[PDB]
Amino acid sequence: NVAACKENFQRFLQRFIDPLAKEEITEPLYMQRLGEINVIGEPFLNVNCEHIKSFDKNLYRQLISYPQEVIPTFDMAVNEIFFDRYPDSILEHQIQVRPFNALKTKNMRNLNPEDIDQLITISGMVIRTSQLIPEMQEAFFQCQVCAHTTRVEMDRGRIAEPSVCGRCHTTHSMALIHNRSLFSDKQMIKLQESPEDMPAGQTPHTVILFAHNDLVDKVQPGDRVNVTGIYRAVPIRVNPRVSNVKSVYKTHIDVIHYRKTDAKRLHGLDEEAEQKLFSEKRVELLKELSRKPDIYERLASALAPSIYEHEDIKKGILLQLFGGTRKDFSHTGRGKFRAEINILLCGDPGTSKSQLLQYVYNLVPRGQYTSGKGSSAVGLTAYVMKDPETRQLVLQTGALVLSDNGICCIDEFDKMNESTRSVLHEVMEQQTLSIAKAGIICQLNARTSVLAAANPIESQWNPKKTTIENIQLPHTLLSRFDLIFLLLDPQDEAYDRRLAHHLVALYYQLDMAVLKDYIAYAHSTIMPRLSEEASQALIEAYVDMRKIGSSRGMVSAYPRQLESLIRLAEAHAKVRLSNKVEAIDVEEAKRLHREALK
Amino acid sequence: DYALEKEKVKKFLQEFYQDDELGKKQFKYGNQLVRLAHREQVALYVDLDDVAEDDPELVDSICENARRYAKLFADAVQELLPQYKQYPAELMRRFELYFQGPSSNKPRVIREVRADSVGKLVTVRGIVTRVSEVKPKMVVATYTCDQCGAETYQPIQSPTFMPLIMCPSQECQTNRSGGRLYLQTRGSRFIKFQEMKMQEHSDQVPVGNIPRSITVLVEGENTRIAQPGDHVSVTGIFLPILRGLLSETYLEAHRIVKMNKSEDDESGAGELTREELRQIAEEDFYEKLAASIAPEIYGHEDVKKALLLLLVGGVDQSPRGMKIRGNINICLMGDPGVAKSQLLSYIDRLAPRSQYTTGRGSSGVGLTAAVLRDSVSGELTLEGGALVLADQGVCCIDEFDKMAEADRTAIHEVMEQQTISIAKAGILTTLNARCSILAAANPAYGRYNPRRSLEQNIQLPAALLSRFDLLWLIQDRPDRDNDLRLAQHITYVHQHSRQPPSQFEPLDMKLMRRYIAMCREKQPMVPESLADYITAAYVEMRREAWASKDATYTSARTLLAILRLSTALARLRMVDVVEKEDVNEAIRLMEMSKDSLL
DNA sequence: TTTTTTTTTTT
Numbered sequence A: 001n002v003a004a005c006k007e008n009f010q011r012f013l014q015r016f017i018d019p020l021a022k023e024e025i026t027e028p029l030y031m032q033r034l035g036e037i038n039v040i041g042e043p044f045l046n047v048n049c050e051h052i053k054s055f056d057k058n059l060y061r062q063l064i065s066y067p068q069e070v071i072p073t074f075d076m077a078v079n080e081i082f083f084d085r086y087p088d089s090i091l092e093h094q095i096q097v098r099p100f101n102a103l104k105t106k107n108m109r110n111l112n113p114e115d116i117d118q119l120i121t122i123s124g125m126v127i128r129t130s131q132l133i134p135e136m137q138e139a140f141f142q143c144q145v146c147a148h149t150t151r152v153e154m155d156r157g158r159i160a161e162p163s164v165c166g167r168c169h170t171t172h173s174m175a176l177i178h179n180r181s182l183f184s185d186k187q188m189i190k191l192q193e194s195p196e197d198m199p200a201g202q203t204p205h206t207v208i209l210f211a212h213n214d215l216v217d218k219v220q221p222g223d224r225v226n227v228t229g230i231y232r233a234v235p236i237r238v239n240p241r242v243s244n245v246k247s248v249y250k251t252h253i254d255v256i257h258y259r260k261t262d263a264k265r266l267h268g269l270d271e272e273a274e275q276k277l278f279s280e281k282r283v284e285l286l287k288e289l290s291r292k293p294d295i296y297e298r299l300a301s302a303l304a305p306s307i308y309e310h311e312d313i314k315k316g317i318l319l320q321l322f323g324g325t326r327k328d329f330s331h332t333g334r335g336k337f338r339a340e341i342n343i344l345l346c347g348d349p350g351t352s353k354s355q356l357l358q359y360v361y362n363l364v365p366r367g368q369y370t371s372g373k374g375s376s377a378v379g380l381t382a383y384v385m386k387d388p389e390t391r392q393l394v395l396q397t398g399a400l401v402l403s404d405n406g407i408c409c410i411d412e413f414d415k416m417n418e419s420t421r422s423v424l425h426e427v428m429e430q431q432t433l434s435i436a437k438a439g440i441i442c443q444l445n446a447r448t449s450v451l452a453a454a455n456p457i458e459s460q461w462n463p464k465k466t467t468i469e470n471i472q473l474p475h476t477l478l479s480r481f482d483l484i485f486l487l488l489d490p491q492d493e494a495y496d497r498r499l500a501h502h503l504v505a506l507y508y509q510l511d512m513a514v515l516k517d518y519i520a521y522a523h524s525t526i527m528p529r530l531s532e533e534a535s536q537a538l539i540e541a542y543v544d545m546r547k548i549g550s551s552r553g554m555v556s557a558y559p560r561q562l563e564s565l566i567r568l569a570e571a572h573a574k575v576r577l578s579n580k581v582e583a584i585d586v587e588e589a590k591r592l593h594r595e596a597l598k
Numbered sequence B: 001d002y003a004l005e006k007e008k009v010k011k012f013l014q015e016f017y018q019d020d021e022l023g024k025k026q027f028k029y030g031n032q033l034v035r036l037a038h039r040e041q042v043a044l045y046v047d048l049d050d051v052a053e054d055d056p057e058l059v060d061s062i063c064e065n066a067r068r069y070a071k072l073f074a075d076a077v078q079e080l081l082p083q084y085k086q087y088p089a090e091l092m093r094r095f096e097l098y099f100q101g102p103s104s105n106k107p108r109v110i111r112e113v114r115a116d117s118v119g120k121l122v123t124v125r126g127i128v129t130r131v132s133e134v135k136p137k138m139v140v141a142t143y144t145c146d147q148c149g150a151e152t153y154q155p156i157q158s159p160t161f162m163p164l165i166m167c168p169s170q171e172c173q174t175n176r177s178g179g180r181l182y183l184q185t186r187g188s189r190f191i192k193f194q195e196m197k198m199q200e201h202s203d204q205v206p207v208g209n210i211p212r213s214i215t216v217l218v219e220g221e222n223t224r225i226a227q228p229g230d231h232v233s234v235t236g237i238f239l240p241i242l243r244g245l246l247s248e249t250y251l252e253a254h255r256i257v258k259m260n261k262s263e264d265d266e267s268g269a270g271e272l273t274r275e276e277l278r279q280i281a282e283e284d285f286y287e288k289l290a291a292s293i294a295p296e297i298y299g300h301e302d303v304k305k306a307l308l309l310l311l312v313g314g315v316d317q318s319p320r321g322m323k324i325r326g327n328i329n330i331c332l333m334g335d336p337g338v339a340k341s342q343l344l345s346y347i348d349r350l351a352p353r354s355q356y357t358t359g360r361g362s363s364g365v366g367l368t369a370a371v372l373r374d375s376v377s378g379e380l381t382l383e384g385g386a387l388v389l390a391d392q393g394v395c396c397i398d399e400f401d402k403m404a405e406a407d408r409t410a411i412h413e414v415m416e417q418q419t420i421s422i423a424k425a426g427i428l429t430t431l432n433a434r435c436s437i438l439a440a441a442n443p444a445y446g447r448y449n450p451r452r453s454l455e456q457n458i459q460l461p462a463a464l465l466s467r468f469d470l471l472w473l474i475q476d477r478p479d480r481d482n483d484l485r486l487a488q489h490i491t492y493v494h495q496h497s498r499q500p501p502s503q504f505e506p507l508d509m510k511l512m513r514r515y516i517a518m519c520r521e522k523q524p525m526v527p528e529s530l531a532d533y534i535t536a537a538y539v540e541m542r543r544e545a546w547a548s549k550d551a552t553y554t555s556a557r558t559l560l561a562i563l564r565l566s567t568a569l570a571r572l573r574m575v576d577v578v579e580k581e582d583v584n585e586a587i588r589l590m591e592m593s594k595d596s597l598l
Numbered sequence C: 001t002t003t004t005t006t007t008t009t010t011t
């Protein structure tokens, strides 16, 4: 069972070819992976245990049925095919092997006891983690008479005491020395099934995963992962004293591999080292697409290809996916400086607001979707819970902190009583949060960006009242936003006809990987710095805004807006990779700021 | 004695005939034993009415003991299986046997089962609560002596058990007088298991008494049948718990049947007959059902035409990742005493999954979902509301104008996106609530009056008024002769307790509840050639309600009514494409809903 | 059988 499998696995690792494409035939697929493992660190080999289903079917039966008696063989059989690069680079730890599956295999509700101790894949949304927990591997005993120190190994899963000193023979004198032994790490994590893939009218479950030595801190609460690992069940004892164990066991999952890369969402900020892993064939494409005179309107108009025209809102929601520069103000003692853009959408019903939130939330990774009445003051930022076991108050993170890199869509913005609405004042302007409760006195921080949607008061935009009266929001909250989009319902018959003609079409029946990579690039290698010709159009663009917004009674302008223009201007320059802010990048993001409130 | 019973059961298992198989006299258990011998089946629901057909004595002594007999049967089948086709005779069982209640017994209530029926076959009815999740329960623990290379087993009965440290094989002990043996979760055998509580129907309780509970240990194959908050009927032994003389008791389920419909679950027998396809194929099948909905109520020929579309429901799309709901919501604004709380009470009983709620007796967190703490553990858990428990069905809210205004905006979420997004201080999730709502309300101050226009003797904010595809508006103006027919109807009802016999007869409730479930799964399409007709209709609407002095707030959410109110009709006529004759029916409905004002 | 924090029904 042991020798018969490494011989059958090495073959796979050597002679395998796929009808696929990687990193944007180079036959030695896993040998190329094994070469990359040698040119850099990171001694892990991510093998797909479905490729081993094409090449073979009698190991793919024994990998998902006896995974703990196979994966050591899959390590050994990789160490030897590392012969090519043995003399070149000599790392130390060992080489590893990690089977996985591109697609899930089960739910959290259909785990049956014919699946105990066999490879299994699920998916969920990590809720909370814990601090490290040691776990002994090699004991270290020592006698009180002979003072002789033997070092017994844990082989089966328990530690046995020798009871005979190899020198003095006192038949029990070998104490266990703790801090001279060897330990390894162990973390406890909790999943939670996704809203999709659950039965009719039911509440989410949780499942406990146990990480191990190297996967110990590779995931954060608020992430959506595809965990792959063995499924085990261990007994429990009714007393912590007697050996009367129960008969209903208790199950967890010894994780073996994570996967956070989903196809449909953009690139999360773990792949900044992976941006240097772009095909140089692709950087040409991006730099050349960034030269056409309207690449702005050509990318924007490719957001949500189901909304009707609404041309400006897609412009704003596209500039929000880039954000101003990340300047470093630690020297001036000013503090930090927000670089993300907050957008508010107000307008009478039926105008397709909630569809834009539902579309963005499904686009960006690391996001959330909240509502009006089903969210409280502390549930959005940070609460304090009586931890069940240790009976102590511990801090947790809300929704505005779990996003932290992404967008926090807050629908039904009007229908939140003024208490829970005055909480956003801190987290959305300073990018911080200062907590001072019973035993916890700390200061979090996040890099979120709200995208809110509200209805006018009376839910009907009556043009008798003033713009600062249909919204009915204060000024200390309207100024923290910088793009207040007033959608309206004009009764032009031509518009209604075109819209209906468009909507009916949804009943019969640019690319993404251009946008999905253009964005990663424009994040990685761009930093627009202002100029002196641009800076001289930014001063007057604020001295006129005051005289304009003063009289009309629409929405006043405070110096904070003058920073928003910066935030917008720079964010425009990033679209075209211009690396330097010029004049037009202020006129555009000034016309945008003016022609949204009309 | 029992040695002669193990033969009187083998006789019955090998000899029993049955005619209703639709063929000749075959063997009900003759085929079953073969299937079980080929490991294509796990459970064998030995009915007891069939033993009570040729031996009404054995039934008397089964329901008297039912604990020995459920073992004699599992020995009889254990012997018969090889004759058709390890050491302990239980590790190689791989099937289980369950008694299906005898018809002569009567279903007790939870309060009735007393101590005089401990250890007998009983039958209870109740509401499920706190169903656990499946966990592996051990049956035959398999140990191994690694030293002497052997295998040993032990069978478990209690909810606890003490392991072994012997290796009682006299050879291993005799040779060396030393050796320990490890437990092992491979050679052992688990079985699914979950516990769930039952409560009395709060209806069948003394006027002000507290309901009593019982515990049910579902295991084997009956798992995952029952959902929490559910009407169920259970059949199983009633035993005491192991480990002074007082004893706590649980019900050990042998058979679980859902009785939601007030009779049974007949999803297996739910197929229609050609003699019913006769009716369903008639010209006006759509018009028979409409008249056979709450026949006790005179008039309202059109309202019953829409309350059927609500039960059938349109189709739901998903283009370019932009969900569109496929349910219909309906309100019944109207004067007092027009039988609205009768129509709703009827549509409650004609739905597989339904819920009934009153506006003045239900809070906004009790509709959607509530987070509540456990003073035993201090842990906050989620608890579904009304709209969650009515996931794939219908919810009914009468007295809808009297619901508190902060407890009513908690429905705007469930009516469009059909999720519930909770971000309180224990939980952060989105439950699925795909319910279609039906509500009733009184217009202004009890009675419509012709002085004030609409929208002021209705008092709904446009944002909520537009969520309803059909806000039906009923009036009652006195009529010297219509009152006469209404009275001659109601007095007939109070004489005979039935409705007067019209030309034809209403279908039974049991039969319509099947006619509809067959009529849901069609999914018709839309033809392109119609997009010009539909369009014009919609345009015309935006004219009238823009050039009138009474009309409501119409928006681009009205077009999707016309669209989704026609895929319902085309779904009744069993077509697989929407035809120009149904668009006009839909358009007539959306017009016959406000004519009661002219 | 005590504090402190957080949610929901009630006067």
Ligand SMILES: Nc1ncnc2c1ncn2[C@@H]1O[C@H](COP(=O)(O)OP(=O)(O)OP(O)(O)=S)[C@@H](O)[C@H]1O
Pocket: A306, A307, A308, A309, A310, A347, A348, A349, A350, A351, A352, A353, A354, A355, A356, A455, A499, A503, B324, B416, B463, B464, B556, B557, B560
């Ligand atoms: N311009 C548009 N493009 C595409 N779909 C639209 C457009 N306008 C309206 N719709 C459709 O009309 C409906 C509008 O619903 P929503 O997007 O939820 O509106 P809303 O802004 O959420 O309404 P309220 O204010 O919250 S009740 C959806 O079915 C949209 O598909």
Ligand SMILES: Nc1ncnc2c1ncn2[C@@H]1O[C@H](COP(=O)(O)OP(=O)(O)OP(O)(O)=S)[C@@H](O)[C@H]1O
Pocket: B296, B297, B298, B299, B335, B336, B337, B338, B339, B340, B341, B342, B441, B442, B486, B490
């Ligand atoms: N057309 C009708 N056909 C049959 N019964 C009717 C009719 N009109 C009234 N009734 C009876 O009159 C009573 C009306 O009571 P409800 O159905 O509660 O009225 P309602 O529509 O709920 O009025 P509100 O909204 O609660 S004041 C019931 O006993 C009905 O059976």
Ligand SMILES: [Mg+2]
Pocket: A353, A354, A411
């Ligand atoms: Mg909305």
Ligand SMILES: [Mg+2]
Pocket: B340, B341, B398
């Ligand atoms: Mg009523």
Ligand SMILES: [Zn+2]
Pocket: A143, A144, A145, A146, A147, A148, A164, A165, A166, A167, A168, A169, A170, A173
């Ligand atoms: Zn010693």
Ligand SMILES: [Zn+2]
Pocket: B145, B146, B147, B148, B149, B150, B167, B169, B172, B173, B179
């Ligand atoms: Zn032994």
